[PDB]
Amino acid sequence: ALWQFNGMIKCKIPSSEPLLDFNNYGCYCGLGGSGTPVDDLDRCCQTHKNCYKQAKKLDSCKVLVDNPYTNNYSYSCSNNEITCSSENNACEAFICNCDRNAAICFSKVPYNKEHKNLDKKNC
Ligand SMILES: [Ca+2]
Ligand SMILES: [Cl-]
């Protein structure tokens, strides 16, 4: 769920408030993703969205009736490392992995302020 993704990002980037810093960024970091990513961070978000799309295709996910952002899963942050729990069932585990990959991606790319609150006209 979104709550967990927020926590994962903070796990990798302790100084951030993910919901504010990574929302409304580029063409893909937010609720609406379209066009060509503007930078590597935006591409992290595009990959994350494509990961969620793949999840929705899996037979194991057609039984949640709970949006992937409200769909809770289990994970831990320890020494700033994310670990998806073995207790997660198929769909939840796939989503956990999508989130973990994106959080790690976020922490490894530059953050370009000029891309925050990007006017969607160039998306
Ligand atoms: Ca367009
Ligand atoms: Cl990690």
From Swiss-Prot:
<feature type="disulfide bond">
    <location>
        <begin position="51"/>
        <end position="98"/>
    </location>
</feature>
<dbReference type="GO" id="GO:0019731">
    <property type="term" value="P:antibacterial humoral response"/>
</dbReference>
<keyword id="KW-0443">Lipid metabolism</keyword>
<dbReference type="GO" id="GO:0002227">
    <property type="term" value="P:innate immune response in mucosa"/>
</dbReference>
<comment type="similarity">
    <text>Belongs to the phospholipase A2 family.</text>
</comment>
<feature type="disulfide bond">
    <location>
        <begin position="29"/>
        <end position="45"/>
    </location>
</feature>
<keyword id="KW-0865">Zymogen</keyword>
<dbReference type="GO" id="GO:1904635">
    <property type="term" value="P:positive regulation of podocyte apoptotic process"/>
</dbReference>
<dbReference type="GO" id="GO:0048146">
    <property type="term" value="P:positive regulation of fibroblast proliferation"/>
</dbReference>
<protein>
    <recommendedName>
        <fullName>Phospholipase A2</fullName>
        <ecNumber>3.1.1.4</ecNumber>
    </recommendedName>
</protein>
<dbReference type="GO" id="GO:0005615">
    <property type="term" value="C:extracellular space"/>
</dbReference>
<feature type="active site">
    <location>
        <position position="48"/>
    </location>
</feature>
<comment type="subunit">
    <text>Monomer or homodimer.</text>
</comment>
<keyword id="KW-1015">Disulfide bond</keyword>
<dbReference type="GO" id="GO:0005509">
    <property type="term" value="F:calcium ion binding"/>
</dbReference>
<keyword id="KW-0479">Metal-binding</keyword>
<dbReference type="GO" id="GO:0050482">
    <property type="term" value="P:arachidonate secretion"/>
</dbReference>
<feature type="disulfide bond">
    <location>
        <begin position="44"/>
        <end position="105"/>
    </location>
</feature>
<feature type="disulfide bond">
    <location>
        <begin position="11"/>
        <end position="77"/>
    </location>
</feature>
<dbReference type="GO" id="GO:0006633">
    <property type="term" value="P:fatty acid biosynthetic process"/>
</dbReference>
<dbReference type="GO" id="GO:0046471">
    <property type="term" value="P:phosphatidylglycerol metabolic process"/>
</dbReference>
<feature type="binding site">
    <location>
        <position position="49"/>
    </location>
    <ligand>
        <name>Ca(2+)</name>
    </ligand>
</feature>
<dbReference type="GO" id="GO:0061844">
    <property type="term" value="P:antimicrobial humoral immune response mediated by antimicrobial peptide"/>
</dbReference>
<dbReference type="GO" id="GO:0016042">
    <property type="term" value="P:lipid catabolic process"/>
</dbReference>
<dbReference type="GO" id="GO:0005543">
    <property type="term" value="F:phospholipid binding"/>
</dbReference>
<keyword id="KW-0732">Signal</keyword>
<feature type="disulfide bond">
    <location>
        <begin position="27"/>
        <end position="123"/>
    </location>
</feature>
<keyword id="KW-0964">Secreted</keyword>
<feature type="binding site">
    <location>
        <position position="32"/>
    </location>
    <ligand>
        <name>Ca(2+)</name>
    </ligand>
</feature>
<feature type="disulfide bond">
    <location>
        <begin position="61"/>
        <end position="91"/>
    </location>
</feature>
<comment type="function">
    <text>Secretory calcium-dependent phospholipase A2 that primarily targets dietary phospholipids in the intestinal tract. Hydrolyzes the ester bond of the fatty acyl group attached at sn-2 position of phospholipids (phospholipase A2 activity) with preference for phosphatidylethanolamines and phosphatidylglycerols over phosphatidylcholines. May play a role in the biosynthesis of N-acyl ethanolamines that regulate energy metabolism and inflammation in the intestinal tract.</text>
</comment>
<feature type="active site">
    <location>
        <position position="99"/>
    </location>
</feature>
<dbReference type="GO" id="GO:0046470">
    <property type="term" value="P:phosphatidylcholine metabolic process"/>
</dbReference>
<feature type="binding site">
    <location>
        <position position="30"/>
    </location>
    <ligand>
        <name>Ca(2+)</name>
    </ligand>
</feature>
<dbReference type="GO" id="GO:0047498">
    <property type="term" value="F:calcium-dependent phospholipase A2 activity"/>
</dbReference>
<dbReference type="GO" id="GO:0032052">
    <property type="term" value="F:bile acid binding"/>
</dbReference>
<keyword id="KW-1208">Phospholipid metabolism</keyword>
<dbReference type="GO" id="GO:0005102">
    <property type="term" value="F:signaling receptor binding"/>
</dbReference>
<keyword id="KW-0068">Autocatalytic cleavage</keyword>
<feature type="binding site">
    <location>
        <position position="28"/>
    </location>
    <ligand>
        <name>Ca(2+)</name>
    </ligand>
</feature>
<keyword id="KW-0106">Calcium</keyword>
<keyword id="KW-0378">Hydrolase</keyword>
